[PDB]
Amino acid sequence: RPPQFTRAQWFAIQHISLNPPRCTIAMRAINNYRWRCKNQNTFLRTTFANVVNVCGNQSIRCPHNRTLNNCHRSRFRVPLLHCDLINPGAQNISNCRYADRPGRRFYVVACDNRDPRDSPRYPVVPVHLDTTI
Amino acid sequence: RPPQFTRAQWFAIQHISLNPPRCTIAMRAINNYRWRCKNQNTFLRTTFANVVNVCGNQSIRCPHNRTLNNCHRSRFRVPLLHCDLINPGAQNISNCRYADRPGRRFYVVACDNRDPRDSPRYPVVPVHLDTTI
Amino acid sequence: RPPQFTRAQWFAIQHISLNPPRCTIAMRAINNYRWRCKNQNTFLRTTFANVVNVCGNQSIRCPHNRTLNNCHRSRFRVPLLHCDLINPGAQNISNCRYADRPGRRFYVVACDNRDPRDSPRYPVVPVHLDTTI
């Protein structure tokens, strides 16, 4: 995560987008902060409050990061846009390109207490998109 | 509710008590604010944070106040102390007496957004103990 | 407003962006829903929760929409990106080009009761960016 963002904020930048552009454009936002392009990324087309609601669901083992057990599965599917890197052999981050896979799935988030700089409206916040179902 | 308390605070005074005195003593705290003694009252022997956790459970019809659908059932039982008025024919609130019924039950709370004067730690707070199961 | 968004959501699409791309890219997200490119637009580099907190500030006359008295000024300045259309002849919205004016100002928002489809976490939500100061 870039220091310019709290974990919650970085979560929102990577994973919350009511109406993202196509993956090749959407992913620049993320990849500008990275050494190499991200292999895959899902943008949930929902609101941060809806994801916070998932944080109060039953705590589960994180499916993709199994050392953690602060994950939570959504009770409802959300529309989303899944992005897949299709040119991992490529010069600049500026040249990374992605295939677009719009969909609708349940999602699983890891949640933690907020950063002091985060809005007091959400003392518990999503900090990682663990997977989608 | 007395104006000296937010709804959350009044909820805590009526329903959260890690180690209450016997019902006849415990109930004075409540009945001092009332015109007549309360017929029944349950004190949950738990912490306010644990009750807030219940606020994120699935929203249900409130069993005892069926015009509301902002209720939530706990996933776990808590020890508690149930108080039952046994002298409804009686002079002062100061003379009300209660039978004591310690127990362990699931509980159902109605939750709402916090008052501005409530701690920012809990933007969603229990405001009524609807029933126990 | 496009109907697939509540007012609060459309407010967020137009005016909330933690890390917007340059105006000429950022404005496409808005102008795709228009026949004519928007003459100007400010993106606040903050979160929706922060703006909702400004809804709780003193109600004032909206400076740019003076028939309304449901506007609220932020207590603090926020970083933002202001976009100004520089080629209003443009035949196709895809061809609109914007000057970029990064800045840091107080903001004034009109707030209203939430749409039923907005989270119950915010009974009052921002619906229009009235101006910045």
Added chain:
Amino acid sequence: RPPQFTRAQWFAIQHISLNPPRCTIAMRAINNYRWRCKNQNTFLRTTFANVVNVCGNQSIRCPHNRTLNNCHRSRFRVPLLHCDLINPGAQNISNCRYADRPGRRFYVVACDNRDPRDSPRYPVVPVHLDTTI
């Protein structure tokens, strides 16, 4: 501390009470767990969440327990009830009698990492009321 309470919980039993009865009644809750009546005790008329927020204030030397440097002063005064034992001869704890000193002061608390059984909502919790100012 009695073992059926975490340190945070025992802190709450001794020092957190929105609406305590007079000292001679209130102190029984504490003295039942002792052979000798407590010489003095302050009840803060606030909530545990509020105190936990004071844990995030500047760490200072604890004024009354100077081997420790994990104390934190409140930014604001709170209403409180101070209790002073007035009959230290007392053979039976049930016979201890207290003078009442309602007041309003800043407080200083020692805070530590939570017990595993304390809510994960507060990684740091108050464990001792060090003094009031």
